[PDB]
Amino acid sequence: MAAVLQRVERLSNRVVRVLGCNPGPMTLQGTNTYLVGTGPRRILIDTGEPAIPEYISCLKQALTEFNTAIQEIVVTHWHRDHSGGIGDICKSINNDTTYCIKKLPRNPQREEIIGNGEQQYVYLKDGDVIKTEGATLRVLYTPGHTDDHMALLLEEENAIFSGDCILGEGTTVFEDLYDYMNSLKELLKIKADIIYPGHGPVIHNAEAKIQQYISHRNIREQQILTLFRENFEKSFTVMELVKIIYKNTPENLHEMAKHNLLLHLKKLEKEGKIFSNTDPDKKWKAHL
Amino acid sequence: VLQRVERLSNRVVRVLGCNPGPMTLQGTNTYLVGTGPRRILIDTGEPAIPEYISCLKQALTEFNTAIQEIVVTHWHRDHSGGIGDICKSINNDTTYCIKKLPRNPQREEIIGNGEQQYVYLKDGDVIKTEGATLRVLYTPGHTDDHMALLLEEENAIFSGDCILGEGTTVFEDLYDYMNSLKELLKIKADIIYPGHGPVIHNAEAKIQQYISHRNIREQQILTLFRENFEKSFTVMELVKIIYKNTPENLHEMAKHNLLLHLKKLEKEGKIFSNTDPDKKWKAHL
Amino acid sequence: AAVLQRVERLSNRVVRVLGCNPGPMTLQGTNTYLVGTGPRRILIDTGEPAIPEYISCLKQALTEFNTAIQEIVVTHWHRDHSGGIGDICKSINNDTTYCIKKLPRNPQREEIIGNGEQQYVYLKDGDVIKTEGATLRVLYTPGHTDDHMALLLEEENAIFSGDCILGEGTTVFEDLYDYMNSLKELLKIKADIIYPGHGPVIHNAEAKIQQYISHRNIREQQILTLFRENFEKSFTVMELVKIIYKNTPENLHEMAKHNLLLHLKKLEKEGKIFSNTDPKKWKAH
Ligand SMILES: [Zn+2]
Ligand SMILES: [Zn+2]
Ligand SMILES: [Zn+2]
Ligand SMILES: [Zn+2]
Ligand SMILES: [Zn+2]
Ligand SMILES: [Zn+2]
What we know:
The structure is a homotrimer. In chain A, α4 packs antiparallel against α5 (206-230) and α6 packs across α7 (254-270). Chain A is an alpha/beta fold. In chain A, the strands form three sheets. Chain A has a seven-stranded mixed β-sheet with strand order 1-2-3-4-5-6-7, covered by helices on one side. In chain A, strands 8-9-10-11-12 form a five-stranded mixed β-sheet, with no helix packed on it. Chain A is elongated. The first copy, chain A, folds into two domains: 1-204, Metallo-beta-lactamase, Chain A (4-Layer Sandwich), CATH 3.60.15; 205-288, Winged helix-like DNA-binding domain superfamily/Winged helix DNA-binding domain (Arc Repressor Mutant, subunit A), CATH 1.10.10.10. In chain A, α1 links the parallel β4 and β5. The first copy, chain A, contains seven helices and 14 strands. The A-C interface holds A 41, 51, 71, 90-91, 95, 97-98, 100, 115-120, 122 and C 23-26, 48, 50, 77-80, 83, 145, 172, 251-252, 254-255, 258. Bound molecules: zinc ion (ZN) (6 copies).
């Protein structure tokens, strides 16, 4: 049932997609790296995984086929399927000048090493604009997936490069559900026409997908709150909650359920709906 | 010469990491524990060894089984390095659950691309599979996160790099290392499945060999200090005296070994150091 | 640009093995050197990680010049100089494990070699590394990196400059103040030859170091003149780039902005210019 994506493909007058050639459980058909612009120098969004020689061949084929070169490299987040190929591109895709690699900083800030260590990131900020011939990209800070997660708005198409915030097929993972839901709510306000995700096919129904993503998490949150508000006098452990909430989940997915539940509890805790205690087996309980 | 895929018992299959080297001997010993269609995998080899993934696929096909979960002894890249490779190459219905002890003090530990996370265990935790029960044994010394596992059905220890099947191992803290060896002795295990080298059938004799080896050198160092209790010694003074029968090409190994021994005796309040630019060591009393 | 052959005897004491890692920052590749005249020699730098071609070249060099590795000396932490450590240990067979020497990071940091079981032996400025037919004095040259080590081959009056001085073109650095100071220190050595980390051999050492000093000093004079002429004015990084880097194209704006900031941090450290706490403007002092 998963779509078979081609290694090099012209998606629009301004976007060309090169597959990372790194399929897997977390990357789907591979990392979707994009060449944005209409001129002889284009912006490269993401670089795939480290040491994938097939991607360098595909990237060289796209640049030759579309008679273009890399202007600069923009990385959505630190995950190695988006930032791993930076060193490989610098060494293999010959250029007059060294490449400029832009990214959002880590939150809190951290030293991030590129290649051998002589190359450094140029850090951007929310609302920054990246310009090329025929394309203007506005930087949209979308934390949740990662603390440095950057989505980009292609103004000329009203298109979003969502990175790993929104995927072309299936759902995604995140570190913080509170920031993730807030980023989805912010992307909704852009009212974008198309989403170019970090993995999976192109999304033509942006509003419906983001709303599907919000509803999926909200239904589970409503289930968890109902349990707490119906049993206000009980302090529940994670194991207690997992057995009640994820009753329709098999035992082989216990650790995934436990992890999902904790992401939901940290969101409700941050919102002040539930409080935890300092017990060795941490207990959660409804307040007020 | 260890063969790459081998059934060691009714519950254990050894898959070699295909990463031989000075520190890994013939390669990392990874083990498939259990008797059912889903087994526990202990250690994963090094990063980017495609030969190991082929050997692991051969074992799973040969023994008509699959991975239930992955258990990592310690953070060293010959033990935790192949996780990303297994997740990408050994196809499964669900993503793998990777279990390990936390770092001490705690640290962020990145698996693969960064989207996979460790499920952290604690000392005494039990990992169950069809036909096998593994008790988690915290054995620090080699590393601050080192885990040994007790296979209850065989009274067997998966020692990781705490105990090797040939020669000795390295460690960070001699005090914790010696304490872990003393703890493993109390288990009174029948067999040891080490992280490198062949299987150990006389567990008691091997752990006692490891303890005695370190204790002989500690006794030599302590005797020098307690006999010359009014004297203070520099590291270079002590290396020339203690490691007299060791060649000059092994000087840095000797100096390193001595310092590991001196930090244990210092922790034990048997010796004390001073604030001199060339640090001097004297017996306590 | 000169075409360097992979294995070459440059001296009665020095033999160079190319890293087989050409690129924008490494030129024709990392220059790794075998120093000494005996059956055991010192290896300066190890190339990049996972370059199988380099291990073949290194094995050819050791066979051709009937020698072996005594110890490994790393100029700095950059992966094109410390990357091949694990590959050499695994592939170039030896009786004992290799001793890998380096200067510490400043401030100190955990530095992982290979799988994690190997550790660096840290040196200090002025330390001497001896082999049959060669004596190397450790020269702490920070600037390029905070751990950067240059070495003086006493018999030849030669400098293994690492990434401080390159055979062709310019180099990059983290701190211009320390970099300029290290170049001034290397000038005092009055070396005959310079064996760089990348590029061909430097036969006119004085002229090369003075070319490297003059290149940075011309730009510093340009910046300082702008500040001293407009002593009442305060400038931002964007204001200063547009004025100073007038002869730099818009495609190199981020490189210019980065270069400028390295120059401003040196002048700030020297108390020639001062910054403010504005959401940032530099003014004369
Ligand atoms: Zn991704
Ligand atoms: Zn991601
Ligand atoms: Zn090991
Ligand atoms: Zn180990
Ligand atoms: Zn360097
Ligand atoms: Zn270099």
